[PDB]
Design a protein around this ligand. Structure first.
Ligand code: HEC
Ligand code: HEC
Ligand code: HEC
Ligand code: HEC
Ligand code: HEC
Ligand code: HEC
Ligand code: HEC
Ligand code: HEC
Length: 436
């Protein structure tokens, strides 16, 4: 037994007061955790032409776009308390959130607009006393809401049909059963992070790399990622957003709904398309990814890929992997040719004032990178098309629903042979295209 139940009677009125207790004995864990991306929101990433500091802190996406000037809404999913703008003290140990991963009561909740602060009226003392090993639902406080359509609210206690590894009646894995954690470094590669292992966890430390009695299926694994055949669908239980058109935001037309009660229009955000039971898109992937970074020039007559997997048929490091792809339109500076990071949340933000010029001006004056590069909002904006790629790794289906020969070959359409660089279906056509 540990001392928790005896030492943490409180009263506690704030998160850091809780944390300041945890540190009388777990200063090491804070120090360790603070070295990681869960605390800094930064990752180094090797792009085709340059190494950058990406991570969430520096990323641009086609959903909410970017954290700067919006921090109080976004850092409800930071393992910290108080990150509300650019003055956040990343060296302050009393600001780590120790409860979000370790709460066992199921009541600990971070206020969705509170810059990481817990909701009002929690029994903090009680939460602190009951702290223990994370389960799926702790990771899921940030990982099941917003997007990746492969981790849903039902991954809290999913069935076999949803995920064979996490299946609470079967293998019942917690996330760290695969994402092994040492010194609060939670293992697992985000897309475009390496080194010479595309997947740090992948499928091959618990399965043989030739796991099939059918040898022809084993020969495919040099080219086709396990994830491709074994995750035939994501968003199995609940719709995910497939498109977000910001260009239409700001009108008082009716805020219409889906088959599934999801909004297809909202004044504050624009138009959406939702989909349930989604086939992935397939692409060559060798462990590296391209990314759009703040300040990059772009071209509005074309779709901009905000991220994209690298590799191709001639790339011996690349395999065909499955991806979720989200498309949209979003705001760009019509004079510089760059995407803008606008203020949507809070005072002057789009969501209260519905004025894109003001949201642009305020979001650009708050962005550290724009400032670093002397970039000023020009005063003119427009909307441009984008696509963004995320890896699909969860919801492995039972073996009976793996893609089989006829999903890809013969009348199968899973793979777009020519987009992948093949000369027709390789089974009809043993002449032109082979991986390596
Ligand atoms: C000393 C008075 C402690 C305070 C205050 C807190 N914790 Fe603790 N914790 C303490 C000990 C001696 C142990 C056992 C360490 C060992 O391995 O010998 C623990 C254990 C934990 C764990 C592991 C829980 C598990 O089920 O394995 C966690 C996750 C943990 N402690 C977290 C934690 C937090 C968040 C605290 C503030 C709320 C906290 N502890 C206070 C000693 C002490
Ligand atoms: C909210 C407070 C989170 C909780 C709770 C957990 N994670 Fe998380 N995770 C969060 C963010 C904002 C990010 C991106 C960090 C960045 O800037 O890069 C992540 C990332 C991951 C990753 C990807 C690797 C990485 O990006 O560095 C993994 C593999 C991951 N998270 C796993 C993970 C697990 C297993 C969790 C429970 C123990 C967990 N996370 C909690 C936000 C939050
Ligand atoms: C998720 C993003 C986490 C945050 C924030 C914190 N911890 Fe953690 N902790 C996390 C994991 C995935 C693990 C391993 C769990 C397992 O099942 O093996 C732990 C482990 C601990 C432990 C025991 C092991 C150790 O390193 O000593 C302790 C004592 C612990 N965690 C405490 C702790 C504290 C005090 C935190 C806030 C400052 C904290 N953890 C944050 C995941 C995450
Ligand atoms: C094995 C059976 C897994 C379980 C259980 C969970 N995850 Fe996972 N995850 C797994 C793999 C093979 C990968 C690819 C990365 C690798 O190094 O092999 C991932 C990846 C992630 C990521 C990164 C996704 C991305 O940004 O590209 C995250 C954020 C993530 N996983 C989170 C996560 C959570 C929250 C889980 C519990 C609900 C979880 N994973 C379980 C394998 C496995
Ligand atoms: C499609 C081209 C596949 C690739 C690539 C991989 N697998 Fe597969 N797998 C596929 C089928 C059609 C089936 C069902 C047929 C069967 O052998 O049952 C499977 C099955 C498995 C299983 C279950 C094996 C059994 O007990 O019968 C496992 C454990 C498994 N596959 C794992 C797996 C891994 C780890 C892969 C990458 C190394 C992999 N498969 C590739 C189709 C395809
Ligand atoms: C260990 C940490 C694992 C990792 C990482 C992955 N898999 Fe797994 N898998 C694991 C176990 C213990 C089991 C059950 C095996 C049994 O004896 O019943 C499985 C099961 C599968 C299956 C079979 C599902 C079924 O129909 O019963 C498949 C097809 C499978 N696993 C594939 C798979 C893939 C593609 C993974 C990477 C994303 C993966 N596994 C990771 C252990 C672990
Ligand atoms: C998609 C995810 C597939 C499934 C399911 C199956 N196959 Fe496949 N096939 C796929 C690719 C991407 C390739 C090219 C591999 C390469 O070397 O570049 C192939 C290739 C073949 C071939 C021609 C090569 C050969 O092995 O002689 C054959 C005859 C073939 N595939 C047959 C086959 C069968 C019988 C399958 C079911 C067990 C099967 N494939 C599944 C993609 C996919
Ligand atoms: C929890 C419910 C979240 C809230 C609220 C917000 N975000 Fe998030 N985001 C969350 C996680 C767990 C991750 C890591 C995903 C992984 O699989 O590795 C992220 C990541 C981002 C990124 C990086 C690129 C991407 O995956 O889209 C960006 C640019 C981003 N998030 C932006 C963002 C903004 C602007 C938010 C508030 C307005 C916001 N997020 C809230 C989880 C959660």
């Amino acid at each position: 037994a540990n001392p928790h139940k005896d030492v943490l009677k409180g009263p506690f009125t704030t998160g850091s007061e809780v944390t300041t207790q945890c540190l009388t004995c777990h200063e090491e864990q804070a120090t360790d955790m603070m070295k990681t991306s869960h605390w800094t929101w930064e990752l180094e990433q090797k792009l085709p032409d340059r190494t950058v500091v990406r991570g969430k802190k520096n990323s641009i996406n086609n959903f909410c776009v970017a954290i700067s000037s919006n921090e109080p809404r976004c850092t409800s999913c930071h393992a910290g308390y108080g990150w509300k703008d650019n003055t956040f003290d990343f060296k302050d140990k009393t600001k780590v959130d120790c409860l979000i991963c370790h709460d066992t009561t199921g009541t600990y909740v971070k206020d969705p607009a509170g810059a990481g602060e817990p909701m009002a009226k929690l029994d903090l003392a009680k939460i602190a006393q009951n702290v223990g090993a994370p389960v799926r639902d702790n990771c899921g406080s940030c990982h099941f809401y917003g997007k990746h359509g492969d981790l849903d609210s039902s991954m809290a206690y999913p069935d076999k049909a949803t995920d064979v590894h996490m299946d609470s009646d079967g293998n019942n894995f917690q996330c760290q059963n695969c994402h092994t954690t040492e010194k609060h470094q939670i293992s697992g590669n985000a897309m475009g992070v390496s080194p010479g292992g595309i997947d740090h966890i992948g499928c091959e430390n618990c399965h043989d790399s030739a796991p099939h009695s059918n040898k022809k299926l084993n020969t495919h694994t040099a080219t086709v990622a396990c994830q491709t055949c074994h995750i035939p669908f994501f968003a199995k239980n609940e719709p995910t957003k497939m498109q977000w058109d910001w260009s239409t935001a700001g009108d008082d037309k009716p805020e219409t709904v889906d088959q599934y009660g999801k909004h297809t229009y909202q004044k504050k955000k624009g138009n959406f398309v939702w989909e349930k039971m989604v086939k992935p898109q397939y692409a060559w992937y060798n462990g590296t990814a391209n990314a759009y970074m703040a300040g990059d020039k772009m071209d509005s007559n074309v779709v901009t890929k905000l991220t994209y997997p690298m590799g191709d048929i001639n790339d011996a490091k690349a395999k065909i992997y499955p991806f979720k792809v989200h498309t949209g339109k979003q705001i760009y500076d019509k004079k510089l040719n760059i995407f803008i990071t606008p203020k949507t949340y809070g005072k002057g933000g789009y969501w209260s004032e519905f004025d894109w010029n003001l949201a642009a001006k305020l979001g650009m004056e708050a962005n550290p990178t724009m400032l670093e590069k002397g970039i000023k909002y020009s005063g003119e904006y427009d909307f441009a098309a984008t696509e963004m790629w995320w890896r699909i790794n969860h919801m492995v289906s039972p073996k009976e629903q793996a893609l089989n020969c006829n999903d890809c070959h013969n009348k199968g359409t899973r793979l777009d042979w020519q987009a992948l660089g093949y000369q027709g279906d390789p089974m009809k056509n043993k002449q032109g295209p082979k991986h390596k």
